[PDB]
Amino acid sequence: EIQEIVKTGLWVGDCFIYTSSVNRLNYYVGGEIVTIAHLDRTMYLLGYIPKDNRLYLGDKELNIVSYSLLVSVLEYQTAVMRRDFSMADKVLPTIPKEQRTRVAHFLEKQGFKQQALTVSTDPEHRFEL
Amino acid sequence: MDSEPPSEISLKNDLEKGDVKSKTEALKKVIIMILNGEKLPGLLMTIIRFVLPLQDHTIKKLLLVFWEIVPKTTPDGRLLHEMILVCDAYRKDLQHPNEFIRGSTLRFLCKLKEAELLEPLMPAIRACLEHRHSYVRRNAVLAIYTIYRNFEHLIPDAPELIHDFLVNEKDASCKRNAFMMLIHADQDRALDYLSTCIDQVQTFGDILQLVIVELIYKVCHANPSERARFIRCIYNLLQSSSPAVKYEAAGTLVTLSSAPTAIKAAAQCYIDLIIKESDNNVKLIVLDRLVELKEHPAHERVLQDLVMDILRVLSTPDLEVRKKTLQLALDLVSSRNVEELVIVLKKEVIKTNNVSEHEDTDKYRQLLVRTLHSCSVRFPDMAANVIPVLMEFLSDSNEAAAADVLEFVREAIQRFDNLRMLIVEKMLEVFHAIKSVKIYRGALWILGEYCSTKEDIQSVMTEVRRSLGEIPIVESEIKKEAGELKPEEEITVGPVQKLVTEMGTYATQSALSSSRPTKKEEDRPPLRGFLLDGDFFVAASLATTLTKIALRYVALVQEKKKQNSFVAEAMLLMATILHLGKSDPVYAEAYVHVNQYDIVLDVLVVNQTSDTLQNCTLELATLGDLKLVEKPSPLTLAPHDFANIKANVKVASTENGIIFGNIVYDVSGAASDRNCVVLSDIHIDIMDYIQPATCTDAEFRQMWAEFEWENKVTVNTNMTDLNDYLQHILKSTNMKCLTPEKALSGYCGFMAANLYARSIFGEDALANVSIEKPVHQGPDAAVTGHIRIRAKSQGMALSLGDKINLSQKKTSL
Amino acid sequence: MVLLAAAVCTKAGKAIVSRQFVEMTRTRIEGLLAAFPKLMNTGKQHTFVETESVRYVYQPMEKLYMVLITTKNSNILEDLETLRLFSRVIPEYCRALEENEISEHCFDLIFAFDEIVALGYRENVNLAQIRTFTEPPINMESVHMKIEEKITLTCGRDGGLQNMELHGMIMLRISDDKFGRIRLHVENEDKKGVQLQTHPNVDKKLFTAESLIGLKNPEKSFPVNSDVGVLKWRLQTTEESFIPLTINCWPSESGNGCDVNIEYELQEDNLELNDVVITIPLPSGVGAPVIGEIDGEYRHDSRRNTLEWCLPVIDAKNKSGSLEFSIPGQPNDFFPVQVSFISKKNYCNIQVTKVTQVDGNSPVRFSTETTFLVDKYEIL
């Protein structure tokens, strides 16, 4: 059961990307809820059109807004969920600063403090691990 | 009867009259005069007589009212007994079938901590043991607790009477309505019972259970009370880097600044903090959490930066919110402050792009050029951005608009040596339409330093040199400037050498060159031509000449410490500068004594006379800001009496209507014309009345400006520094030596103190004590100090002026 | 008090009507109300504003302020809520706020104030309420039984039993092959108190004489909680429980000082208890004690105001001490002495008479052990 409520949602693979009533775009992996991104306003998932390389959102308007799904983050975290911590580390060169620390914290929550230590950019997170 | 202290004779009459309304009104009038604090015992027998047994609630309620605010004091109609006229027939009142009279009676009776009513209040819990309302049961737990408080911490108040004696507190927990007067010192079993009650709550009652016993294992269980404790409990379980995202704190918090812009400004601050925790350099201060709203994905839709743009402000919302917002742009994003300040400054500073950011008032324009430019001086990357934007500033092409632009950029070149070669050609352009000083000054400096780069210069300079506008300060700036950089690298009909010729003529010489200069006579008296005239050893060439000076920057020039800088964005700074950050014969003999830190005025009162002075009373008075902490109290001053009587003294009070002199001391005795005489004990001054307060350099400076302090005296025995005599004496005329206004060196080094006080005289008091202690071969007057003084109409200025000399008193009786 | 006063003000520069719950703020009430409510309580159109170190809560009505003042606070919601209820009650009496009409109904308002907030604690009121007032390995086969019990006692100096109760369980750890039926025989118990719990797999047998319990044990260790009393019960120490220790206290008035002799008695001499401590309390004006004891160590401890005697193991034994006291007050009643102890028997008197196992040959009851521990054991 997932913490952030699903106002609307979409399945990208077996991973569920949904909007939340917090305006949070989160994805469900593992039975764990991660925030892929923050929505600034209230948005609904029209669908994911591979052509545009985008997820198409709409406001109150019958027009288009687009969010590309942050696949590198999602794949890092998904791999972590599966208990493929090394695999998620291959993703890490393309996870930036603070995101490596976060993804590391994901890795850690699932378990393996050390692999999380190598990816975490932040020294403090390394130091605690 | 709002407050009328003499009316007690009419009240007695009104109190019994055979008309119930009149009696009620009378008793009511007594209540209102006592509450204010006025005369009441005369009435007592009358008051007490009608009301006593009756179940008729209104008079009874009124009398019941008067027994909790003065019962002890009033004694005509009551006197002292165990079953007083407060409670004797109010045992009937307690035992009436109507809940209101019983309940009321119980409630006042048990409320008193009176010992002359201790017994009657104890079985007074009977009146509310049966609970006809929520009010009756609450009234009971509070009354048992009040009985417990009133000398019954043991077995008189603890068990049950027939249902409560300290057990309503237990009962309440399981009953339909709760309220626990059990906060301290009461039954353990009830405390335990309240815990059980957290679940089976009554919400008002829950706030009573909760003050006693807090922290839950749950999320909640319901109701505002539990909810209010809960945010406290949450802050515990995550203290770390503020709350960050405010919990249930948010609801009270808005009202905390209802006046009206300040809430948004505050809210904006939290929202900025929350975004991210950055590097936290100089004005990069965003705390809270590192990731919780990120910054800056390239797939995030419609992005974080949209909210970040609000914070970049010209005033885009209103001024209070503006000042907060500019700091807040700087705080989330920059390198320090420099990066986001350049962007922000680019928007604010004057252009040809938008005319909603340009203005024809010269100082503001200039300041805005300096703010943009200070970012370069701070950080390199900004130099490259600044120079092209500066040329856009110029493109406005008003005399003045060019002018301001030229003035900063020229400073930037002093910092930024042969890096801004490119700008010179742009800078000349608007130099020809001219009505001001500033344009000439600045242009002549760019065109002058930059000569190697260009070759135009006779042509550009010459239209201006034979044009008019305002030219004082033009002279100074052109004087050091015109030749510079490379000896022969220009030519239009005047090479660099013609320029040195010109440069010299403009400074103070004479020469046909650029169709003569506009003026020659220099700016402010000290500057003159001569230094530069001597100079240009090697004709306008980088060596040890004007060029050197021009392509170098005076002292250290780095940061935003205000060394070729101006410290952020010019509009935000005005607000920061504003912020001061202020923090019958009678004989007396007397001395002041202190034992065990008790300060007392010793007085001895002497009757050297054989005559009668009986009727002798001694008083110390409250004059104004002087006060008695206890007058001398002996009934002494009798035939050939010597007595020592101690009058305790205070220095701090509020002004009384009687005289304002030294210390008044009053002895009374026999005599009927001068029953009271005023005679003196030793000196206390007018100066006491001043109240000490302090200033910082900003408050001192502001007040200096605010009102004149020209007035000076020189005070002897200011030979010494600030710290010694001068501080101690200044203290006694309630002043204090704070911050400096000095400028010390090997030739300078008068000690300077900035003084402040805020006198209870309708004035402040300020002064500067300058101590002329020789740090030169020719001192003012040697050791001594001149105190420059003021007060707000300089009526206390004078107090400062002489109370920094000397001051001492002693006696040895 | 948390609530100094509940006050209706006119910003004429005076407290129009006001209430002092208990004599404290008489004249004080008028000066506070007169200065602060004039400035809007120094507010800015905010319900809470604090000035001169006193919390003022208010509501403006005309040239008048209805004011609540506190200088302490128990909760956020509460302060507003009493003010609020007051604001339902005040127009019933005075038709909004207005100095002359407020003045005339001093009695009405004042009475409501006493009723609403009583001794500074915010009670509740209502307009109707106001009215009343103004009216396979079997070679291995072994079994072990462990009876762990705690006994509690309260006793008088006289040696009155008062109340007592034993709590315990008998755990069995058995290594037996196959599934063997076991029958347990124990003594018969009575209990003033109550409690008995039986493990599942416990059967009750009815016999003409004697009582029996039978069960297939789980292997390893488990709480037997057999039938009969059960092998998990609270029995009353009162019901036939032995109290391993009896303390006889003889206090004596040496005069200025006090001499206390404490007598300890144990059960059969052969049995020895361990971890025994006697806590003999002392009065507040202690001076110093001199204590003597044949066995163990005894030490006086101030703070605790108790003398503690500790004995590693005892067949049985006694102690004496002399106390020195300054004598303030009069004589003081004694507080009870408590003891901690361990005994290798159960004083619930549970005896395992016989546990016979079937489904196979004789197992060895390698050991039965009893651990007895003191609970709240108090004697005056």
UniProtKB/Swiss-Prot annotation, chain A:
<protein>
    <recommendedName>
        <fullName>Coatomer subunit beta'</fullName>
    </recommendedName>
</protein>
<comment type="function">
    <text>The coatomer is a cytosolic protein complex that binds to dilysine motifs and reversibly associates with Golgi non-clathrin-coated vesicles, which further mediate biosynthetic protein transport from the ER, via the Golgi up to the trans Golgi network. Coatomer complex is required for budding from Golgi membranes, and is essential for the retrograde Golgi-to-ER transport of dilysine-tagged proteins.</text>
</comment>
<comment type="function">
    <text>This coatomer complex protein, essential for Golgi budding and vesicular trafficking, is a selective binding protein (RACK) for protein kinase C, epsilon type. It binds to Golgi membranes in a GTP-dependent manner.</text>
</comment>
<comment type="similarity">
    <text>Belongs to the WD repeat COPB2 family.</text>
</comment>
<feature type="modified residue" description="N6-acetyllysine">
    <location>
        <position position="109"/>
    </location>
</feature>
<comment type="subunit">
    <text>Oligomeric complex that consists of at least the alpha, beta, beta', gamma, delta, epsilon and zeta subunits. Probably interacts with PEX11A. Interacts with SCYL1. Interacts with JAGN1.</text>
</comment>
UniProtKB/Swiss-Prot annotation, chain B:
<keyword id="KW-0472">Membrane</keyword>
<dbReference type="InterPro" id="IPR016024">
    <property type="entry name" value="ARM-type_fold"/>
</dbReference>
<comment type="function">
    <text>The coatomer is a cytosolic protein complex that binds to dilysine motifs and reversibly associates with Golgi non-clathrin-coated vesicles, which further mediate biosynthetic protein transport from the ER, via the Golgi up to the trans Golgi network. Coatomer complex is required for budding from Golgi membranes, and is essential for the retrograde Golgi-to-ER transport of dilysine-tagged proteins.</text>
</comment>
<comment type="subunit">
    <text>Oligomeric complex that consists of at least the alpha, beta, beta', gamma, delta, epsilon and zeta subunits. Interacts with CAPN8. Interacts with SCYL1 and PRKCE. Interacts with COPG1. Interacts with ARF1 (myristoylated); this interaction is required for binding of COPB1 to Golgi membranes. Interacts (via trunk domain) with ARF1 (via switch I region); the interaction is direct. Interacts with KCNK2 (via N-terminus); this interaction increases the channel-mediated whole cell currents and promotes plasma membrane expression of KCNK2. Interacts with STX17. Interacts with TMEM115.</text>
</comment>
<dbReference type="GO" id="GO:0005793">
    <property type="term" value="C:endoplasmic reticulum-Golgi intermediate compartment"/>
</dbReference>
<keyword id="KW-1003">Cell membrane</keyword>
<keyword id="KW-0333">Golgi apparatus</keyword>
<dbReference type="InterPro" id="IPR011989">
    <property type="entry name" value="ARM-like"/>
</dbReference>
<dbReference type="InterPro" id="IPR029446">
    <property type="entry name" value="COPB1_appendage_platform_dom"/>
</dbReference>
<keyword id="KW-0963">Cytoplasm</keyword>
<feature type="repeat" description="HEAT 5">
    <location>
        <begin position="301"/>
        <end position="338"/>
    </location>
</feature>
<dbReference type="GO" id="GO:0005886">
    <property type="term" value="C:plasma membrane"/>
</dbReference>
<dbReference type="Pfam" id="PF07718">
    <property type="entry name" value="Coatamer_beta_C"/>
</dbReference>
<keyword id="KW-0677">Repeat</keyword>
<keyword id="KW-0653">Protein transport</keyword>
UniProtKB/Swiss-Prot annotation, chain C:
<dbReference type="GO" id="GO:0043473">
    <property type="term" value="P:pigmentation"/>
</dbReference>
<keyword id="KW-0813">Transport</keyword>
<keyword id="KW-0931">ER-Golgi transport</keyword>
<dbReference type="GO" id="GO:0000139">
    <property type="term" value="C:Golgi membrane"/>
</dbReference>
<keyword id="KW-0472">Membrane</keyword>
<comment type="subunit">
    <text>Oligomeric complex that consists of at least the alpha, beta, beta', gamma, delta, epsilon and zeta subunits.</text>
</comment>
<keyword id="KW-0007">Acetylation</keyword>
<dbReference type="GO" id="GO:0005794">
    <property type="term" value="C:Golgi apparatus"/>
</dbReference>
<dbReference type="InterPro" id="IPR011012">
    <property type="entry name" value="Longin-like_dom_sf"/>
</dbReference>
<feature type="domain" description="MHD">
    <location>
        <begin position="140"/>
        <end position="380"/>
    </location>
</feature>
<protein>
    <recommendedName>
        <fullName>Coatomer subunit delta</fullName>
    </recommendedName>
</protein>
<dbReference type="GO" id="GO:0015031">
    <property type="term" value="P:protein transport"/>
</dbReference>
<keyword id="KW-0597">Phosphoprotein</keyword>
<dbReference type="GO" id="GO:0030126">
    <property type="term" value="C:COPI vesicle coat"/>
</dbReference>
<dbReference type="GO" id="GO:0048193">
    <property type="term" value="P:Golgi vesicle transport"/>
</dbReference>
